């Protein structure tokens, strides 16, 4: 109908969201290695010189 | 409202409170 349940119930969206498990990953290096990775990714491996840097460019 | 009439209403409230106090002074 208009509303699928009791409207004012607390923790509604949290309760009914689909629990999607964390995706397992390779370890992300931390510390000086992370700064080196960022430096390589931004100032020696310039990817999209057009426009801005556009870090995290949405895929479309 | 105008400031004039707000002032006058305040004066009338003071009227009532003053007569009440005078009756009980």
């Amino acid at each position: 109908g208009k509303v699928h349940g009791s409207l004012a119930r607390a923790g509604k969206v949290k309760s009914q969201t689909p629990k999607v498990e964390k995706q397992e990953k390779p370890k992300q290096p931390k510390g000086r290695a992370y700064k080196r990775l960022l430096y390589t990714r931004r100032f020696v491996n310039v990817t999209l010189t057009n426009g801005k840097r556009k870090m995290n460019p949405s895929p479309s | 409202m105008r400031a004039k009439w707000r002032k006058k209403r305040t004066r009338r409230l003071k009227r009532k409170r003053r007569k009440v106090r005078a009756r009980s002074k």
Binding site: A8, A10, G11, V13, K14, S15 | -
Partner: protein
Amino acid sequence: GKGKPRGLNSARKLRVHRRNNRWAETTYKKRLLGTAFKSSPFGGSSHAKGIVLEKIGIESKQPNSAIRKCVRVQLIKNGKKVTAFVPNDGCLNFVDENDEVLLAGFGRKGKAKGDIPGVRFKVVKVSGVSLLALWKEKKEKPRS
């Protein structure tokens, strides 16, 4: 030239003029009158514990339509009663009635924040445990 005197022997009136004008501020007046200790729910206190009396929700303003889940808490330090906000999504059920809850400031200098009317305090801890640890299931309520 200007309103203030300028002579070399006018320190007295300059000082007293500044001292009389300082009361025009709000921070200085609050600090010197010490209204925080006498009138505010906490006397110069960042946090304070209290007991949950009942479990209320309060509607928002015009531009924002919702009901923010609050809680009425009587402070233990002095006995005052204040409404407080249970911050996150599914935290209303976490805090049960008549349990000790540590209220904190709401971040807007003791004034209502956002669209929630007549509230000035968050909720940080309940029954000794923090709400943020409960909300991510890092800890659980002791249920005593």
